[PDB]
Design an enzyme around this catalytic site. Structure first.
Site, mmCIF file in Angstrom:
data_model
loop_
_atom_site.group_PDB
_atom_site.id
_atom_site.type_symbol
_atom_site.label_atom_id
_atom_site.label_comp_id
_atom_site.label_asym_id
_atom_site.label_seq_id
_atom_site.Cartn_x
_atom_site.Cartn_y
_atom_site.Cartn_z
ATOM 1 C CG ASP A 1 9.462 23.522 9.753
ATOM 2 O OD1 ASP A 1 9.558 22.044 8.690
ATOM 3 O OD2 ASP A 1 9.384 24.034 8.566
ATOM 4 C CG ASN B 1 9.345 20.717 3.420
ATOM 5 O OD1 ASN B 1 10.185 21.453 3.228
ATOM 6 N ND2 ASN B 1 9.136 20.139 3.829
ATOM 7 C CG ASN C 1 12.430 19.730 6.657
ATOM 8 O OD1 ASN C 1 11.376 19.319 6.654
ATOM 9 N ND2 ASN C 1 13.659 18.981 6.866
ATOM 10 C CG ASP D 1 13.202 17.622 3.054
ATOM 11 O OD1 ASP D 1 11.860 18.723 2.976
ATOM 12 O OD2 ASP D 1 13.547 18.056 2.858
ATOM 13 C CB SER E 1 7.527 20.392 7.315
ATOM 14 O OG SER E 1 9.426 20.412 6.948
#
Length: 129
Positions: free
Chosen positions: A48, A59, A46, A52, A50
Site C-alpha cells: 500500500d 509502519n 508494504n 516498516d 507505506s
C-alpha cells in the site's frame, strides 16, 4: 546494527520494555527476531506504499514520518529514519505507544503468527539479565 539475542534482551530491559503492558521480554525478543532478524536497519515496503522500519518494523502508515506515505500519520512524532538507529531508544518509545493502542502485540502480525502462544521464554533462555 545486528544484535545478538541476549544483547537485545538486555537493551530492551534497560529501556523498560520487559513486561511493558504485561508482555514479557521473550515476547519482545521474539517479535524482533521475526520482524527484523535483530537488524536495526531493516526496512520493508508494504503493498500500500507505506514502509516498516527497524528492529520492530514500525509502519509509516501510522507511527512515523518518511515523507512518502500519503494520507498517513506520525503518531510517534519521529522521522522513520530514527527507527534505524543502533540505539533502540526511539523504536522502544514508539513500540510502547503501539502496544498501548488497544490490540496489544497483535499490532505486529509476525508476533501474532509466530510468537503468540509459543514458548517465548526460550528467547531469553540463558541470558544474563
Amino acid at each position: 546494527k545486528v544484535f545478538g539475542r541476549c544483547e537485545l534482551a538486555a537493551a530492551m530491559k534497560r529501556h523498560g520494555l520487559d513486561n511493558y503492558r504485561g508482555y514479557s521480554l521473550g515476547n519482545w525478543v521474539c517479535a524482533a527476531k521475526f520482524e527484523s532478524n535483530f537488524n536495526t536497519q531493516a526496512t520493508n515496503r508494504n503493498t500500500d506504499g507505506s514502509t516498516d522500519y527497524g528492529i520492530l518494523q514500525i509502519n509509516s502508515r501510522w507511527w512515523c514520518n518518511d515523507g512518502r506515505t500519503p494520507g498517513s500519520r506520525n503518531l510517534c512524532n519521529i522521522p522513520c529514519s530514527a527507527l534505524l538507529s543502533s540505539d533502540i531508544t526511539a523504536s522502544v518509545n514508539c513500540a510502547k505507544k503501539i502496544v498501548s493502542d488497544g490490540n496489544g502485540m497483535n499490532a505486529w502480525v509476525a508476533w501474532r503468527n509466530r510468537c503468540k502462544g509459543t514458548d517465548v521464554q526460550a528467547w531469553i533462555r540463558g541470558c544474563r539479565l
